[PDB]
Amino acid sequence: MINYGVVGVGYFGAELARFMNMHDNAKITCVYDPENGENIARELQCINMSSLDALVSSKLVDCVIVATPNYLHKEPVIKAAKNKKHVFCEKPIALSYEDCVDMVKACKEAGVTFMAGHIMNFFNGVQYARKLIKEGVIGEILSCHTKRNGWENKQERLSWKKMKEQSGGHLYHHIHELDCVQHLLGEIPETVTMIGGNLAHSGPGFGNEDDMLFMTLEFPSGKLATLEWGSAFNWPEHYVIINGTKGSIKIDMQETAGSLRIGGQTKHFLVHETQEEDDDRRKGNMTKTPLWLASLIRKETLFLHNILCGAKPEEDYIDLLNGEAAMSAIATADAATLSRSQDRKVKISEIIKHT
């Protein structure tokens, strides 16, 4: 029923392909990947296409899954749209707002579905927190806060992930937390500030990205947010906190657990699908796709496949299909990048209104 071609079958694209193939009436018919396509095509018993054009124009393809490096997402999406193929694109959708808007527009004009692969929206704990927030259990929302802070040792080989021009750095490569804040609040920030530096990953054998980033967001409703990322933190933390007038929620990914705190009493909830998934994630942080992420890939590919088969998306995920989550995440990231580069606070209008 739905045939898929995968552009980029490295670590994550190969997993997307394996999990998609598990769904009834879904089939990976081909891949395009100069370095890894031969091996993956043999594993999947599909065709290793000799060029991007051969894949996106193939009659064997109904939907193109894009899982190339972050700076290489645009051409596969634009060419898929030109060939009237549906598109799933991994995060970050692109490394500039102009590129992201061009991608959304191309799919809109071609009349094809375009899904942004913002997988954190599918976390059990994120869905649940959103419902608690919406129902009013923590009152009016006042602020959100994220951290994604750890220590990365020098690596034997330097990969594209550490090069700002290829990955976008922590902000774009780990854009999940920023998209999550905007998803939970349902607003885009009017003013964006970001400070950062390369404090311990500068010199031979290292990339050129900042290894600490400290962002502050101000929203038109008056709500506020802070977001931190980096790879130079010997005090590790990884969380989203939502503060309301009646209580607060923490989605802790490091010491994996959700907490709902009301009247100084705390109730536990799951981040992932089961306590086993949360416990495994926590054990691994203390200590090659982990269980929690495998389950999410299965769920996200199933969502995509069901949409292409005609299902109506639940309201939680509509912004993944209309371009709004992608454009809003990249817009704020672009504003933060400008703020860091130009040593100033940035109005989101500078990004959204530039052209």
Q: Find the shortest distance in angstroms from Cβ 224 to a second copy.
A: 6
208 interacts with a second copy by CB under 8 A: no
Residue 6 or 132: the one with the smaller Cβ distance to ligand NAD is 6
Instruction: Select the binding partner of residue 299 from a second copy, ligand NAD, none (C-beta < 5 to 8 A, by kind).
Output: none
174 interacts with ligand NAD by CB under 6 A: no
118 interacts with a second copy by CB under 8 A: no
- φ/ψ of 10, rounded to 5, equals -80, -145
* Among 3, 4, 5, 7, contact with ligand NAD (rule: CB under 6 A): 7
Q: Is residue 91 a known part of a binding site?
A: yes
Instruction: Select the binding partner of residue 7 from ligand NAD, a second copy, none (C-beta < 5 to 8 A, by kind).
Output: ligand NAD
Query: CA–CA separation, 350 vs 344, rounded Å?
Result: 12
Residue 23 or 299: the one with the smaller Cβ distance to ligand NAD is 299
Peptide bond into 92 cis (omega under 30): yes
Query: CA–CA separation, 83 vs 5, rounded Å?
Result: 13
Q: Is residue 36 a known part of a binding site?
A: yes
Residue 226 or 289: the one with the smaller Cβ distance to ligand NAD is 289
| 348 contacts: CB under 8 Å, gap ≥ 6 | 188, 189, 190, 191, 192, 331, 332, 335
Q: What DSSP assignment string belongs to 234-297? A: EEEEEEEEEEESSEEEEEETTTTEEEEEETTEEEEE-SSSSHHHHHHHHHHHH----HHHHHHH
291 interacts with a second copy by CB under 8 A: no
Q: Is residue 173 a known part of a binding site?
A: no
As beta bridge partners, residue 196 has: 213
* Among 250, 282, 298, 305, contact with a second copy (rule: CB under 8 A): 250
Q: Is residue 160 a known part of a binding site?
A: yes
* Among 200, 270, 291, 294, contact with a second copy (rule: CB under 8 A): 200
Residue 62 or 90: the one with the smaller Cβ distance to ligand NAD is 90
Query: CA–CA separation, 354 vs 95, rounded Å?
Result: 16
Query: CA–CA separation, 143 vs 249, rounded Å?
Result: 11
Helix (H) or strand (E) run with residue 195 in it: strand 191-197
91 interacts with ligand NAD by CB under 6 A: yes
Contact 261, 248 (CB under 8 A): yes
Q: Which residues contribute to the site for ligand NAD (CB under 6 A)? A: 7-13, 32-36, 67-70, 72, 90-91, 117, 119, 173
Residues comprising the binding site for NAD(+)?
Answer: 11-12, 33, 36, 68, 70, 73, 90-91, 160
